[PDB]
Amino acid sequence: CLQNGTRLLRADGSEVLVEDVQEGDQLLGPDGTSRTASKIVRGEERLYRIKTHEGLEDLVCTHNHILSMYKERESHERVDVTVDDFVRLPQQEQQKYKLFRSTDATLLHINSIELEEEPTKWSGFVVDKDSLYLRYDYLVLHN
């Protein structure tokens, strides 16, 4: 699940804040097709902040949120990993994993991932099909 205020893409290309996503809403998938959201849930807790080397907005999300990544050795394979499991990996293993944006340097290198010191509100939902959808800057996100 994602920090409130995270900007996502509707299926029509306009932006919607994650907490404004409602049941049945259509989001944009990484291949360009529609995704249906359901099971809207909300809570409040200390989230993890992920910062990239590249100048993109931080991703802030719950400890059980699933990151969709590319892992080295094309050149990279698709892997899903929870924030908890990724956080606990040794940094030499972590550097093999990259976030990514949907094509049309699309890999993003994580510079830091840290637990925040105060709780903040988050919103989550499930997405059909491959469970992938787009942030406003085309970062690929998972359920």
Numbering used by the authors: 1 to 73, 90 to 120, 133 to 171
Please give me the paper's original passages concerning this structure:
At the heart of the spliceosome is pre-mRNA processing factor 8 (Prp8), a large (approximately 270 kDa) and highly conserved protein. Prp8 helps generate mature mRNA by coordinating critical rearrangements at the catalytic core of the spliceosome. The intein-containing precursor undergoes protein splicing, a process that excises the intein and ligates the flanking sequences, called exteins, to form the functional protein. The intein is also found at a highly conserved site at the center of Prp8 and thus is at the core of the spliceosome.
The Cne Prp8 intein was solved to 1.75 Å resolution. The Cne Prp8 intein structure represents only the second known fungal nuclear intein structure. As with all solved intein structures so far, the Cne Prp8 intein has the canonical horseshoe shape, created by pseudo–2-fold symmetry that positions the catalytic N- and C termini in close proximity. Highlighting the splicing blocks (A, B, F, and G), we see the active core that carries out autocatalytic protein splicing. This catalytic center contains the residues essential for splicing: the nucleophilic cysteine (C1) in Block A, and the terminal asparagine (N171) in Block G. The C1 and N171 are also positioned in the vicinity of the conserved Block B TxxH residues (T62 and H65), which are important for priming the intein for self-excision at its amino terminus. For example, Blocks A and B are far apart in sequence but fold proximally in 3D space to execute protein splicing. This representation also illustrates that the unresolved regions of the intein are between Block B and Block F and likely represent flexible linker sequences of a former endonuclease domain. The unstructured regions in the Cne Prp8 intein structure are where the Sce Vma1 intein encodes a linker domain (dashed red lines). A closer look at the active centers of the Cne Prp8 intein and the Sce Vma1 intein demonstrates unmistakable overlap of the catalytic residues, further confirming the similarities.
